[PDB]
Amino acid sequence: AMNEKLAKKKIVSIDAGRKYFSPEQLKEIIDKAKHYGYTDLHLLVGNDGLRFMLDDMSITANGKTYASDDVKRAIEKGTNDYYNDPNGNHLTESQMTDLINYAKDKGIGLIPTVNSPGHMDAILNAMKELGIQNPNFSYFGKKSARTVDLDNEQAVAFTKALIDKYAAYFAKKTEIFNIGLDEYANDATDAKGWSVLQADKYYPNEGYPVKGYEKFIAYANDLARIVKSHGLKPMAFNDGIYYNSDTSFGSFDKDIIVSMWTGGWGGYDVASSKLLAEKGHQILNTNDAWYYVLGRNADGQGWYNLDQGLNGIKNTPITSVPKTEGADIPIIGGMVAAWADTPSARYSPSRLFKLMRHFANANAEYFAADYESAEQALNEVPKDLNRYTAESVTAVKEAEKAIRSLDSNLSRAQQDTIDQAIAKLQETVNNLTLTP
Ligand SMILES: [Ca+2]
Ligand SMILES: [Ca+2]
């Protein structure tokens, strides 16, 4: 009576924050997602760069309104300062609405990310262009290019209002909004950002940011409240959520779905997925075992190269969550992610599709089967069979019935059953024999 594996989300993530992707390119990704049995496209649009412009970008914060055309010009410029992509700067509202509709018609959902308080180079740049002072976080004379200072009330207020504006747009047409929250001040702190934010509590009078991590919890919780008010489920990457398993600074909103991408590394001690589940968070398995950075296309070409990602897909199943502590961790689904850390890299659709295809093949019981050729085969049957012999007619009608009788919820693992049924139909049609 249950289809627990197929009921999971299967998601492909595309980094269209750092790098421009056209509507045509994204529709092709949606097509392949549908074909391979995925349920959703996770489209980062704010991730270092910001590459999605609403028709009205006016922002009310700090006792004033920043005019829509000024906000647009500030964001376009700020994104260009991060990376001026010769292929394009941003998707428009019309293009996004069309894209979401295109995906919806195929049974594919779209999940956007607009990242903060890290990975927001372009938003920080935009704020400065609007005239907001000192938005960037700094750590002992090292200014972060990507991370907002949570002590800066004006920068924080603007950012929250911007997330609110995007969330209002995505309301009703999507179900999940990814607020990001990953990798606080990674540049300025040599990947010690969460330690830095927590440090003052335990090492006072050493110049660490006062109430740094407490302010981050408040910030995360406020974004969650904003997203939830629009009927959307907030999602965030795991690394800063109870960093160091420290629950003493406050509590994260339980309605935040956790995208569990990392089990951490030496000197970067993240909460286990066990702890996060126990605190009451649903988890989307986003294991970085499966990561692919565009342009790192073969073994030896760096971390998250395509060969590494395909190896990760082969060796780490959709059910294998980072840092389980040996516990059985339930999941809402799995997400394979392609990134543009070097956004000048060439986007290769065939390589992305290979990654997507391997993820589906390695976990085939979880992915939907493809009925599109079955549907087309049925469309291609001759409508009128009267001029053919009763015997050959019966064979076609039986073969048609057989395809139409297939379980409508088969997995990719059972694709052969569908394909066999199509072949049988084609055979019976070919064998239709005109009456004497
Ligand atoms: Ca990173
Ligand atoms: Ca190789």
Swiss-Prot record:
Region ranges (Catalytic domain 1): 3-436
Subcellular location(s) of the protein: Secreted, Cell wall
Protein origin, superkingdom: Bacteria
Coiled coil: none
Family: Belongs to the glycosyl hydrolase 20 family.
Protein name from the UniProt record: Beta-N-acetylhexosaminidase
Gene assigned in the entry: strH
Residues shown, of full length: 181 to 614 of 1312
